[PDB]
């Protein structure tokens, strides 16, 4: 019935507004859209377009801005002319040609969409309602921001993230021990600050050699795309804008890059960063009489950015005094004089000692205890002070109250976190296995020849060559000589693997060439599946090899090549490792053993060291095992003794025949070990470590997350969501889904999706084993994206359904009404903790009686069925006059339910916000590091929350009509 001049809207992109018929041919019709002025031509058949007509009682607006009230409309030759009373002038009998209607006819509360022609589906209405329910419940979940990160659930990490991510403008120095996960806690804190809306602009400054590492870590672990800014990018952004740094929210850059020009550093300091993060800040040397030009640029940055995180190391066994140069940067007024800090650390040293005696299980003389009593400046200290020391029944709880009070009285522990490998439980024990092999005669002959031919060469290089026999047999027996046939180590390796076929074994060698030769020999003489992991490979190929190695029982049994390691997520399923060779320096030895020796392993570690009899290997095994205890224990004595013994030991390497003098070197090594151990145990700040590990509340949080991580409703909602959106989901089978778009996807391009597809896993352990997959949680960008896509659009907001129930009258009306309570506030305030968009379901009858409390949603939805487009279309209009009368029925109950929800939310707000503000005030009353700005921020945030909550409103989001038939 298309006729030139009619108004039509698109059922889907109504954001275009009204259109106007301006041409018609045999197959097509053309709509002009005055909102933009464009024309769109559609095929007459299947007609996915909607007639826009109005009925008596509607108020409409004309192109001149005035509005009116329609009372009667004539139609002739397909065109409508509206007749009614112009309301702004009170003129009756006013005519408005439909061509002159405005475009600002937006998707009214769906009791208006009944007359839009084809209406949405009923499974998208189901997804719409389920989505609002799940999103509402999950936004208020207590531990938001702590499940989507691709990490192990390590207690101290979760504790640090929980504590720091909730602070305002956090300024902290992370001096965690090397290898514990400093950057992991940093990334978690970043994930919280970005997810909570507290921050939008972030700047991370990293040495260039680590820039790519950061790029991948934030991308693969935290789903965060940073824009790298180099000189080229800086120039192309200088052309596009006055300030180049306004084009991206998240920026990585180098500190050397930051110092290039002065206008560069000022533009950087003016980019209004919310957070700044600088790793390895110990490289910033500062002298009281001469601070470097390097430190000055960070000091300039940290003054223009509220929150600033510094990651660092505390090496060479020195104290936090070396840290003053950086403490001065965190709180320059609180920490402003070195000497006072020196006095503080010296006068606290006895206190630290006395604490170590307390917690070690010793009695503390009154003379000792009346110095801690001097520290805690109170007067009812005595009874609790003595109960802890007499070893009464509650001596444990009195010790715990003492330590708790100590942490609250420590001068720095709130701003400094040092977790040690001694203050953390979970590491597996390590047992050693040594195997003495006969040196084959081919090597004796090959090395004595190198000895003769080795006339003019340093003993250092004599020891570097004789270390690895494989690489001297390639100079005298010719390159590529088949040395893999007589070396007994190879036979031992094969025999052990073929005898332990049901065990995954990690085999470490020095260089990739030897690894390729090992793969070739294991394949061509025993068919052993082994993936190589060397520096020459790309990230995707090595990831592929890790994937193969992760196959439970059908993949590679063995692995591995040169150093590389660095794989954050570890092989927690692997518990047996063999050292095909031994490194030179003890740091490489401890890092190699470190790659597996991590918290979260399956079982204890079995280390197998096959070494040739009477060679440098035989020397080094003796040095490492009896002397340093470096295999079974991890104490970092190696470097000091190695430097103190280097020139002597060289001779013991270049000539393993001379055995005398060795055993005294070994006793010297054990003496050095004992001295270093003693000094380190006597340097432990056990109070700082107790404040660092979070304790029982942190373990409780970690187990609450371990129990929240089995949500199967999440997977069941996900499948529905994607499938409805039109995302093909190929089930590979081994807990991995491959998502690929489809011809029927619902959006031009989906932000995260690509045509090549992405693999996902819902199990945290699989994610920790397969870093090539996306770890899907409630906080994953894919889900949040789809959520915004549905809850912002209007699909799933209106449908009709029939019910066949003999026990009800024909033509009865049940009306599902989904109101949404919302507040309008900037996301920076984080109102969503207290009032996200909240659904309010109501199942009205003809009398306005609610049945939802009696009739659950799922059960009711199951037994319902849809109609066909056409008959249903006017079947809706059959009750157009009825639904209007249905609305006032709910009008009286919506105000009661709303006022109940608002009242409850405002109550929860004032209690929790006053309890937290009181806690922070108590801290200011108990700790000197809490700033005025902090308390002001919380007070203003509480006031703003009560204010924005006092103006919250409701709106009709969804509406489903139900009509019972028996036909």
């Amino acid at each position: 019935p298309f006729t030139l001049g009619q108004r039509w809207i698109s059922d889907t992109e109504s954001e275009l507004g009204l259109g106007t018929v301006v041409a018609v041919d045999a197959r097509t019709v053309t709509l002009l859209f005055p909102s933009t002025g464009e024309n769109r031509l559609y095929a007459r058949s299947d007609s996915p377009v909607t007639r826009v007509m109005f009925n008596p009682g509607d108020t409409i607006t004309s192109h001149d801005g005035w509005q009116m009230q329609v009372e009667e409309v004539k139609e002739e030759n397909g065109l409508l002319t509206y007749i009614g009373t112009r309301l702004d002038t009170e003129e009756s009998g006013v005519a408005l040609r439909e061509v002159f209607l405005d475009s600002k006819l937006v998707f009214s509360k769906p009791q208006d969409r009944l007359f839009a022609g084809q209406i949405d589906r009923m499974d998208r209405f189901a997804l719409r309602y389920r989505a609002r329910k799940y999103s509402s419940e999950q936004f208020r979940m207590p531990y938001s921001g702590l499940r989507g990160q691709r990490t192990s659930l390590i207690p101290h990490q979760l504790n640090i993230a929980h504590d720091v991510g909730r602070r305002h403008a956090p300024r902290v120095l992370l001096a965690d021990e090397v290898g514990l996960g400093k950057t992991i806690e940093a990334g978690m804190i970043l994930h919280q600050q970005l997810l909570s809306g507290a921050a939008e602009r972030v700047l991370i400054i990293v040495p260039e050699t680590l820039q790519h590492q950061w790029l991948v870590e934030m991308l693969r672990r935290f789903n965060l795309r940073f824009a790298l800014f180099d000189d080229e990018r800086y120039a192309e952004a200088q052309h596009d804008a006055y300030n180049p740094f306004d084009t991206e929210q998240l920026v990585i850059c180098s500190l050397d890059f930051a110092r290039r020009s002065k206008q560069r550093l000022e533009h950087l300091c003016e980019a209004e960063w919310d957070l700044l993060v600088v790793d390895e800040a110990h490289h910033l040397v500062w002298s009281e009489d001469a601070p470097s030009r390097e430190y000055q640029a960070i000091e300039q940055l940290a003054e223009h950015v509220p929150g600033v995180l510094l990651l660092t190391a505390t090496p060479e066994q020195l104290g936090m005094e070396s840290h003053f140069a950086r403490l001065r940067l965190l709180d320059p007024n609180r920490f402003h004089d070195f000497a006072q800090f020196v006095e503080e650390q010296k006068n606290y040293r006895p206190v630290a000692d006395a604490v170590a005696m307390l917690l070690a299980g010793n009695k503390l003389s009154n003379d000792e205890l009346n110095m801690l009593g001097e520290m805690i400046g109170e007067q009812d200290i005595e009874p609790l002070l003595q109960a802890a020391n007499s070893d009464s029944e509650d001596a444990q709880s009195a010790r715990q109250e003492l330590v708790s009070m100590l942490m609250d009285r420590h001068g720095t522990s709130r701003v400094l976190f040092r977790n040690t490998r001694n203050g953390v439980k979970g590491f597996p024990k390590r047992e050693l296995h040594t195997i003495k092999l006969p040196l084959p005669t081919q090597y004796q002959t090959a090395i004595k020849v190198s000895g003769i031919m080795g006339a003019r060469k340093s003993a250092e290089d004599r020891a570097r060559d004789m270390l690895y026999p494989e690489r001297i047999y390639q100079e005298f027996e010719g390159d590529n000589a088949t040395w893999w046939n007589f070396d007994p180590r190879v036979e031992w390796l094969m025999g052990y693997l073929t005898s332990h076929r049901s065990q995954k074994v990690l085999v470490i060698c020095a260089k990739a060439a030897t690894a390729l030769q090992l793969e070739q020999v294991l394949r061509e003489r025993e068919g052993i599946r082994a993936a190589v992991f060397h520096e020459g490979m790309s990230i995707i190929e090595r990831d592929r090899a890790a994937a193969w190695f992760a196959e439970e029982d059908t993949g590679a049994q063995v692995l591995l090549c040169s150093e590389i390691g660095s794989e954050g997520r570890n092989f927690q399923f692997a518990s047996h490792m063999v050292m095909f060779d031994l490194p030179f320096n003890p740091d490489l030895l401890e890092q190699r053993i470190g790659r597996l020796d991590r918290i979260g392993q399956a079982h204890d570690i079995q280390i197998h060291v096959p070494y040739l009899e009477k060679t440098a290997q035989s020397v080094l095994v003796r040095w490492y095992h009896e002397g340093l205890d470096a295999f079974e224990h991890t104490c970092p004595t190696g470097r000091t003794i190695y430097d103190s013994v280097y020139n002597d030991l060289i001779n013991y390497l270049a000539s393993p025949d001379q055995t005398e003098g060795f055993d005294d070197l070994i006793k010297n090594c054990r003496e050095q070990h004992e001295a270093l151990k003693a000094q380190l145990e006597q340097g432990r700040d056990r109070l700082l470590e107790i404040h660092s590990n979070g304790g029982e509340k942190a373990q409780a949080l970690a187990e609450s997350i371990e129990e929240q991580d089995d949500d199967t409703n999440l997977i069941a909602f996900a499948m529905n969501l994607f499938d409805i959106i039109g995302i093909n989901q190929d089930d590979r089978g081994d807990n991995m889904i491959v998502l690929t778009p489809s011809d029927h996807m619902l959006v031009p391009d989906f932000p995260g999706l690509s045509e090549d597809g992405i693999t996902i896993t819902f199990d945290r352990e699989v994610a920790l084993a397969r870093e090539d997959a996306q770890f899907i949680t409630w906080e994953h960008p894919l889900i949040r994206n789809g959520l915004d896509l549905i809850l912002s659009g209007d699909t799933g907001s209106s449908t009709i359904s029939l019910l066949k129930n003999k026990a009800l009258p024909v033509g009865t009306l049940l009306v599902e009404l989904i109101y949404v309570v919302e507040a309008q506030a900037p996301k920076q305030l984080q109102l969503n903790r207290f009032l996200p968009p909240t659904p309010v379901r109501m199942l009205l009858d003809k009398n306005g009686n609610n049945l939802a409390a009696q009739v659950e949603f799922e059960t009711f939805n199951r037994q319902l069925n849809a109609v066909n487009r056409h008959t249903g279309s006017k079947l809706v209009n059959a009750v157009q006059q009825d639904v209007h009368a249905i609305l006032q029925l709910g009008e009286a109950q919506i105000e009661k339910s709303a006022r109940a929800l608002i009242d409850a939310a405002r109550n929860e707000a004032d209690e929790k916000l006053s309890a937290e503000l009181s806690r922070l005030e108590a801290l200011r009353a108990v700790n000197p590091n809490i700033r005025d700005d902090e308390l002001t921020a919380i007070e203003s945030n509480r006031q703003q929350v009560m204010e924005s909550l006092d103006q919250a409103g409701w709106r009709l989001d969804a509406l489903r009509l139900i009509v019972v038939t028996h036909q």
Binding site: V216, S538, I540, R544, W548, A556
Partner: protein
């Protein structure tokens, strides 16, 4: 031109295990239905990747030229031993390893 390289998109390393670096099965290998007889890559054009996307590709190593595989597979339900291989090159700049 299509390529014979062993770098084949979205194939598990199981399938590559039996292929040499040149992309030809090892003489004497036991095969089964569905295994990849030889590796071939179909060229892809007009990728038009964004410059940041190009940088990401560079670090990751993803190849715009590939993304499609024309690799021959063993016919369904036939399984035997590869006894012989022959290579016929019309133009080739130099004789291939296998050649």
């Amino acid at each position: 031109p299509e390529e014979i390289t062993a770098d084949i998109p979205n194939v598990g390393e199981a399938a590559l295990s039996k292929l040499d670096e040149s992309g030809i099965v090892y003489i004497g290998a036991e095969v089964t239905g569905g295994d990849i007889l030889v590796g071939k890559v179909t060229p892809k054009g007009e990728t038009q990747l964004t410059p940041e996307e190009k940088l990401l590709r560079a670090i990751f190593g993803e190849k715009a030229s590939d993304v499609k595989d024309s690799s021959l597979r063993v016919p369904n339900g036939v399984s035997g031993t590869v006894i012989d291989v022959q290579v016929f090159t019309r133009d080739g700049v130099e004789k291939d390893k296998r050649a």
